[PDB]
Design a protein around this ligand. Structure first.
Ligand SMILES: Nc1ncnc2c1ncn2[C@@H]1O[C@H](COP(=O)(O)OP(=O)(O)OP(=O)(O)O)[C@@H](O)[C@H]1O
Ligand SMILES: Nc1ncnc2c1ncn2[C@@H]1O[C@H](COP(=O)(O)OP(=O)(O)OP(=O)(O)O)[C@@H](O)[C@H]1O
Ligand SMILES: Nc1ncnc2c1ncn2[C@@H]1O[C@H](COP(=O)(O)OP(=O)(O)OP(=O)(O)O)[C@@H](O)[C@H]1O
Ligand SMILES: Nc1ncnc2c1ncn2[C@@H]1O[C@H](COP(=O)(O)OP(=O)(O)OP(=O)(O)O)[C@@H](O)[C@H]1O
Ligand SMILES: Nc1ncnc2c1ncn2[C@@H]1O[C@H](COP(=O)(O)OP(=O)(O)OP(=O)(O)O)[C@@H](O)[C@H]1O
Ligand SMILES: Nc1ncnc2c1ncn2[C@@H]1O[C@H](COP(=O)(O)OP(=O)(O)OP(=O)(O)O)[C@@H](O)[C@H]1O
Ligand SMILES: O=P(O)(O)OC[C@H]1O[C@](O)(COP(=O)(O)O)[C@@H](O)[C@@H]1O
Ligand SMILES: O=P(O)(O)OC[C@H]1O[C@](O)(COP(=O)(O)O)[C@@H](O)[C@@H]1O
Ligand SMILES: [Mg+2]
Ligand SMILES: [Mg+2]
Lengths: 761, 761
């Protein structure tokens, strides 16, 4: 089973997408965990060509304390030698000299195209090499097949077969940090913010940034503006002014063009806005800042997961299986053949060269086209000539969570678009019982994207204690549908209404839960809205804490995370920060396990690594509290290291939503409203709505590869109501990666890796 | 004493310098604290002109929860009406309609010039107004004098009479956050980062940014580059490359010009670098980003202090005293007449218009010229043809503090420039005893500016125990001077070596202490190096913690800060965050005070403010611990508010240095090395150095007005060695401002405000 006796090469090429270091670290430590030799190829294809000193065998400590570092410690370089066979043969030679039959390439679209051409010529190159006399025929029959696992590391997301690439989330973090400097200010005068992003070829970053910030206008090469856009944009900005909105945001991609080939410069848009509107217009160009900064939490987790799966795919790959790209579609890890993805990239590039230009946006992926449609719908209120008798109320229930406001904003706009009479209720079910219902308009949710917490009130109270008041207010306002954006109490409340349908006919209304909580403890989804924000805040605090012990001092930090009984937050935070241990309820531990971990910490602490970090979920154990672990680690580490403690309380809670949370809540609010409308039309009969079937009460759910509406009655089986968490949680497999990356010899035979799947056309 | 029966107008005009809201809050809350009526003039001189609805009386809750908001809630506008007498008379009318004889103007150079011209014509405007018949002669003899107290709110720092303006520090935070996105990444390939700042008129932001980032080249309008700079710059980048330095930083202000009037564009410098060097050159333009984000801690404290002092100066001002600008030169508050500052601004502007252009940089202020000289000296190693037999050792003692590395870098470069043989000892006095002395060069400290913690090791061990080893290693390495960068342990250790001079002849060496600690507990200075970073990290956590209760929920947070017995960090953090109380050791409190403050919080929480925040210094009280205050506040607030606890542990410690800390440590490290060289030349006699007088062992200050050198023996009198803090600390008067801004009726007769001072030519 283990890949002993075989060597794995890892290289980085192209622009240094942040999060590359996490992928390299995971690749290295998995490769030497399974017994394979890991060789770090410095400067990418450059050092592949020259080789020699540029190829060094890695140990466990060679990739230590890099997961928080942006860029790449291995280094990347543009080399033209790999384009030509003269240098590619030298690259094949240098790989044969080290016995590297397995190569992991972490790079952009050009990097993976070069890897594809390198596999396609690997046999011919070896033949010509033995023919020229630099390797004997023996020692060439071995290494006859080169195994390639590709990792898409780039801020462009230009590789068509892949939905999400390493560094995209962090590039978005940098962008929105810049934008939030503008939008979170008390807007004092009319000003126009023109942001130039480096999406020269791909406009994915420009699109997702515009969606996250609620940009007034977007210039992307995928959809150039129509003729006469000068007037159409300037009028849109004009009514934006008339509304009293004091800030306009223009997201211009570097590759902004018109319907012809003429590029649109940010300076042109600046002077255009200045001339017709007179707004104080200044162009912000990020430049290198997009690739800068630390990798986001998402980037660290996902890079670690894909690097691990890259290694495993590279060892279970026979001579016949093709070069693969380890990526995630949705939440599900998948392997796509390199050739098909490269072919799709070539087809889309030909399409963008005025061949199938109007139909190039669909080949970019359904995610891109869907994102662009959602952006345009939410940007400007188009006139909804359609009207419906349907009326829906939007609740926020449970604890506040970052991204509730993004979901509610999109739900309000989308419901107005369908002609629904949209209400909001403050204070969740407390206000729905108290009749604190207020009809809301399009502009009443203006600027709710970046606001953390809840603009509507939130309360944890369940509806069962005020069921009479709830049914009364439903009757009064004629609420035909009920959208509940909240945590486990949102799901439990909607469940109590479904169970109460038999007593009260008025509760037979379409209900939809958007799970929005820090803990990620709601059944029926893989990610709760705002879990990403909590994880990002948690790692930032943990990185700050871990950086406080200067290089000489040996110190361990016990950092207590929130999340209730759900250990998700602690474990992912440990992966992101390289925590030695993440104690959680779902993995019960006793004093024997603690002594093992503490001795493991001590032994590790005698080596060159000097800062340890163990995470504790707040409700992981009844007796072995944070103070207990502090005493244990400080006692056993006497004369080796000191121990310190830090309970991250509400530092993980109140932050503004990360860009992932904004876009994710945006999408789920749209998708929830679409399904609400579809179900309400399906259920409207006899002149009234009568929602009795279980399908009318669903959690929106992002599950594995796709969004999936799970009826709450069905989910009741798989819900641990005592602990307020699901019984079978998908993320327990991430514990295995966490423990592996901390040198724990854990037999991860239970980990399932994504299989080969053809591209979805 | 109180200014009852009189009204104070406050307006903001010009660019919305972040931290304006803090100044407005302090002006408002002081004006209604002293019984004066506070009128908020919206849109600045615009709403001054139109008046009416734009002039509103302020209450205490009008400035609630605004201190952390950037921009200005009052709003600023550019109005041309105030330029002409037609609108200025209307402005005087609207002020007379509300009886506002007192005006506080928070704005830039143009704002204060307009305020000066408005005072100068106030009598003439009132005469023409009564002549035209809009006000009777009675009601015009009163209000005959208009009192103006100016506050310089701008990112430009173009107002010549003033050294520091509101928003400069936070604009620098924005700039360096962008630069740190580039520099902290693992620099993988040769790239050039060209940052364009909006210093169109003043290049102070460009200069201080370059100093903090260690820019390779700087284009500032104060000192345009000489003819043929094209080649000289490109060669500088060339040898930078040859060193292996993989990143070049070019800070180009918007107002970058050559010796002629032709501006130098960032695009030109880009294309220049691309053509001759081929580096990946991308221009970053911040634009509106500089004015964005939250105000820094410094900005909130200084805005609060100056706004309070503006009100107080406005009440003690008779008809004869002129318009003043409340500012701080050094750490000392001062009031400068508005007319002289406007005159200096006009002189520098005329000088910059090719009149005395080479001599315009000096009239900008000695701080600018000194900063540029320090920048150029540290930027590029010039050949030190001078040499000296002197040798010095640089220590890092105590806890690690953000900015020690910046200090050590500057000390190394400045010592090498003066021909000294610079040693660095790792692990402080432990290394000095153990002989961990390593001679250091120019490039050994490359990129130490932005690195947090301590590159050199730190140890708290005092030198008395191993004094024989210390003198032995001083003799072996021939150490003639000792530069000790560190906290209270640094000062105490240098004091021990000075006291042991009588026993050991070798200890008669010139010594200098750079106070570098989180606690700001080192006697002889007002700001220890790295205290600003800790304050900024503390408020950021407090703002997050305050942001976490949302909507309806009424909750108080007890936040525990570090700092030992020194309460400085708690109190300033409480000012910056609007904390209700900051319990500190230096202000002993009993249960009677706690019941007063808890009932005060309860009454406040019944009002519309819902998030109280009190700070606890870690060692303020022996028995009333954070758990005690949690229990007290949660019990008494039962049925009114919930209580939660967060102990900010090492979240206040490990952060990278803020731009203030970098610049401060840079400057004083240079100044400490200058003072060391001067003292060593003054003490060299009989062919050897013999430093026996007390003046040869000093703590570099910045104590009230400028940098000072206090001998450690003299400071021993005013040092509480049991508590490791000075006996008389300047900042205890800031408690009065904190308590006043939290509605505590505290008789601040002990507070001293800066008096009138003429400009320093
Ligand atoms: N079709 C190809 N064949 C061979 N090598 C290639 C091909 N495309 C790119 N490469 C190699 O991969 C390296 C990286 O390519 P490039 O500089 O254009 O950025 P990229 O791969 O497209 O990703 P990114 O935009 O993030 O930087 C190049 O130096 C080149 O040597
Ligand atoms: N906020 C926006 N930013 C950029 N382009 C926009 C925005 N809104 C609309 N557009 C684009 O301008 C064009 C016309 O816009 P509009 O929606 O008003 O009419 P339309 O023909 O019906 O467009 P659509 O196909 O999306 O329904 C469309 O091609 C659309 O893609
Ligand atoms: N983080 C924030 N917290 C609080 N208020 C905010 C925040 N960001 C923006 N706002 C406020 O939201 C208000 C509404 O304008 P905003 O720019 O935010 O949304 P918009 O772009 O105009 O509308 P839309 O969401 O449809 O795109 C602004 O005046 C601003 O004060
Ligand atoms: N010489 C002047 N006389 C009268 N009013 C003036 C004068 N200069 C500026 N003002 C007034 O002050 C307002 C703001 O001034 P300005 O546009 O020059 O910015 P500023 O005060 O200098 O600060 P900043 O440049 O940072 O934005 C102007 O709208 C104008 O009404
Ligand atoms: N890092 C830098 N940034 C900006 N300007 C610089 C830098 N270094 C040198 N200069 C400028 O280039 C010019 C010549 O530089 P250089 O120091 O090498 O010769 P110099 O005769 O000693 O001039 P000076 O000492 O007065 O600055 C000087 O006017 C100086 O202001
Ligand atoms: N916060 C940081 N942490 C770790 N390393 C850093 C940090 N900042 C800069 N560096 C490193 O310092 C190294 C030295 O190059 P750098 O660009 O930073 O300045 P330099 O040109 O070499 O010297 P100078 O101080 O005069 O600017 C860089 O390679 C960079 O990796
Ligand atoms: O109920 P949820 O959805 O799990 O909310 C999680 C948050 O609530 C908590 O229970 C704490 O809430 P409180 O501070 O108000 O007591 C933590 O688990 C976490 O901070
Ligand atoms: O000794 P100083 O100079 O006051 O250093 C301040 C730091 O030392 C502390 O006592 C904590 O130090 P430790 O974490 O090593 O235990 C805190 O007061 C603060 O974080
Ligand atoms: Mg690419
Ligand atoms: Mg100005």
């Amino acid at each position: 089973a283990s890949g002993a006796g075989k060597a794995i090469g890892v290289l980085t090429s192209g622009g240094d997408a942040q999060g590359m270091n996490a992928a390299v670290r995971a690749v290295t430590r998995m490769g030497i965990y399974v017994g394979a030799k890991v060789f770090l190829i410095y400067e990418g294809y450059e050092g592949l060509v020259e080789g020699g000193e540029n190829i060094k065998q890695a140990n466990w400590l060679s990739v230590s304390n890099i997961i928080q570092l942006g860029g790449t410690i291995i280094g990347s370089a543009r080399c033209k030698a790999f384009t030509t066979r003269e240098g590619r043969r030298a690259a094949a030679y240098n790989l044969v000299q080290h016995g590297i039959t397995n190569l992991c390439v972490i790079g952009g679209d050009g990097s993976l195209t070069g890897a594809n051409i390198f596999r396609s010529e690997w046999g011919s190159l070896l033949e010509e090499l033995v023919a020229e006399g630099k390797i004997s025929e023996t020692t060439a029959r071995t290494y006859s097949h080169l195994n390639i696992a590709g990792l898409v590391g780039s801020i462009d997301n230009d590789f068509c077969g892949t939905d999400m690439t390493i560094g995209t989330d962090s590039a978005l973090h940098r962008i929105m940090e810049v934008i939030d400097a503008i939008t979170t200010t008390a807007q004092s005068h009319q000003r126009t913010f023109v942001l130039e992003v480096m999406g020269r070829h791909c406009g994915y970053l420009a699109l997702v940034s515009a969606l996250a910030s609620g940009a007034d206008w977007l210039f992307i090469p995928e959809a150039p503006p129509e003729d006469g856009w000068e007037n159409f944009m300037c009028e849109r900005l004009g009514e934006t002014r008339s509304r009293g909105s004091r800030l306009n945001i223009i997201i211009i991609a570097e590759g902004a063009i018109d319907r012809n080939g003429k590029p649109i410069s940010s300076s042109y848009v600046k002077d255009l806005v200045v001339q017709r509107l007179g707004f104080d217009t200044r162009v912000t160009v990020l430049g290198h800042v997009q690739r800068g900064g630390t990798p986001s939490a998402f980037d660290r987790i996902l890079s670690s997961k894909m690097g691990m799966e890259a290694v495993m795919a590279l060892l279970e790959a026979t001579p016949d299986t093709p070069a693969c790209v380890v990526t995630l579609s949705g939440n599900q890890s998948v392997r796509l053949p390199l050739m098909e993805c490269v072919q799709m990239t070539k087809e889309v590039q030909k399409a963008m060269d005025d061949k199938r230009f109007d139909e190039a946006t669909q080949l970019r992926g359904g995610s891109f086209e869907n994102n662009w449609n959602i952006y345009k719908l939410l940007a400007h209120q188009k006139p909804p000539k359609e009207k419906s008798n349907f009326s829906l109320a939007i609740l926020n229930v449970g604890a506040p969570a970052a991204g509730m406001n993004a979901a509610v904003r999109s739900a309000v706009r989308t419901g107005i678009s369908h002609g629904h009479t949209v209400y909001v209720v403050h204070d969740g079910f407390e206000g729905l019982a108290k009749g604190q219902v207020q009809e809301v308009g399009w502009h009443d949710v203006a600027g709710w994207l970046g606001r953390g917490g809840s603009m509507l009130g939130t309360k944890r109270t369940l509806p069962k204690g005020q069921l009479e008041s709830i049914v009364e207010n439903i009757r009064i306002y004629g609420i035909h549908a009920l959208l509940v954006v909240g945590g486990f109490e949102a799901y439990e409340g909607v469940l109590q209404l479904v169970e109460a349908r038999g007593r009260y006919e008025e509760l037979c209304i379409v209900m939809c839960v958007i799970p929005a909580t820090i803990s990620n403890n709601v059944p029926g989804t893989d990610f709760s809205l705002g879990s990403d924000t909590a994880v990002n805040a948690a790692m930032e605090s943990c990185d700050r804490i871990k950086q406080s012990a200067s290089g000489t001092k040996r110190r361990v930090f016990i950092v207590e995370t929130m999340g209730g009984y759900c250990g998700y937050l602690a474990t992912v935070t440990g992966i992101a920060v390289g925590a030695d241990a993440a104690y959680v309820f779902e993995d019960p531990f006793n004093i024997h396990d603690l002594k093992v971990n503490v001795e493991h910490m001590t032994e590790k602490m005698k080596t060159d690594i000097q800062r340890g970090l163990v995470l504790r979920n707040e409700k992981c154990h009844d007796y072995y509290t944070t103070e207990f672990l502090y005493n244990l680690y400080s006692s056993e580490g006497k004369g080796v290291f000191d121990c310190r403690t830090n309970v991250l309380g509400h530092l993980q809670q109140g932050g503004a939503p990360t860009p992932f949370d904004r876009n994710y809540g945006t999408k789920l609010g749209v998708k929830a409203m679409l399904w609400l409308s579809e179900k309400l039309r399906e259920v409207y009969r006899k002149g009234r709505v009568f929602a009795n079937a279980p399908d009318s009460a669903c959690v929106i759910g992002l599950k594995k590869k796709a969004v999936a509406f799970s009826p709450v009655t069905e989910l009741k089986k798989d819900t641990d109501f005592e602990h307020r968490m699901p019984r079978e949680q998908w993320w327990l497999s991430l514990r295995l990666m966490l423990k592996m990356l901390a040198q724990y010899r854990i037999s991860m035979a239970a980990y399932v890796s994504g299989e080969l799947e053809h591209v979805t056309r």
